[PDB]
């Protein structure tokens, strides 16, 4: 059930999990919760999500609470600014340290508590 886009396969889960249990599922399938590195990938993801909320690979790193990608893609604060929902990340309840795709818009991301359960998206490279 993996979908193909620009050199990567993506798995849109049918069962919801916490952010970390989701990541562990992806890891068990030789993948990671997805990074987002272009407008075209953001568009593929939010369009495919079809208005449902999915965990993606966004999570905090370092003392300073900087956002990062679990697949180790360097996080580009400048180039990613256009991808959050207006007002996010807002760090609500001082307890939102993971990120999901929420709005079907280029401005799609929300920060949410890592222990909330949502559907999730794994990303696996194709290696010819
Ligand atoms: O408004 C953005 C905000 O939405 C969600 O927070 C909840 C809502 O704002 C609303 O239902 O009020 C709730 C109680 O105060 C609040 O929890 C979250 O998805 C949050 O991450 C987001 O920033
Ligand atoms: Ca939030």
Numbering used by the authors: 198 to 325
Quote the study's own text:
Langerhans cells are characterized by the presence of langerin (CD207), a C-type lectin that can act as a pathogen receptor by binding to surface glycoconjugates of microorganisms. Langerin has an extracellular region that contains (1) a C-type carbohydrate-recognition domain (CRD) that binds sugars and (2) a neck region that mediates the formation of trimers. As in other C-type lectins, the CRD of langerin contains a conserved Ca2+ binding site that binds to carbohydrates. Here we report the identification of additional glycan ligands for langerin through screening of a microarray of bacterial lipopolysaccharides and high-resolution crystal structures of the langerin CRD bound to carbohydrates representing a spectrum of ligands.
In order to investigate the potential modes of binding of langerin to both eukaryotic and prokaryotic mannose-containing sugars, we determined the crystal structures for the monomeric full-length langerin CRD bound to various mannose-containing oligosaccharides. For both ligand complexes, electron density was observed in the conserved Ca2+ site in each of the four crystallographically independent copies of the CRD and was fitted with a mannose. In each copy, mannose binds with the 3-OH group interacting with the Ca2+ ligands Glu293 and Asn307, while the 4-OH group interacts with Glu285 and Asn287, which are part of the EPN motif. In this orientation, the axial 2-OH group forms a hydrogen bond with Lys299. In all of the Man4 complexes, as well as in most of the copies of the Man5 complex, only a single-mannose residue is visible, and it cannot be determined whether this corresponds to a particular mannose residue present in these ligands. However, in one copy of the CRD–Man5 complex, there is additional electron density that is best interpreted as an α1–3-linked mannose. Moreover, there is weak density emerging from the anomeric oxygen of this second sugar. These observations indicate that the mannose residue in the primary binding site corresponds to the outer α1–3-linked mannose residue at the nonreducing end of the Man5 oligosaccharide, consistent with the suggestion that langerin can bind to mannose residues at the nonreducing termini of branched structures.
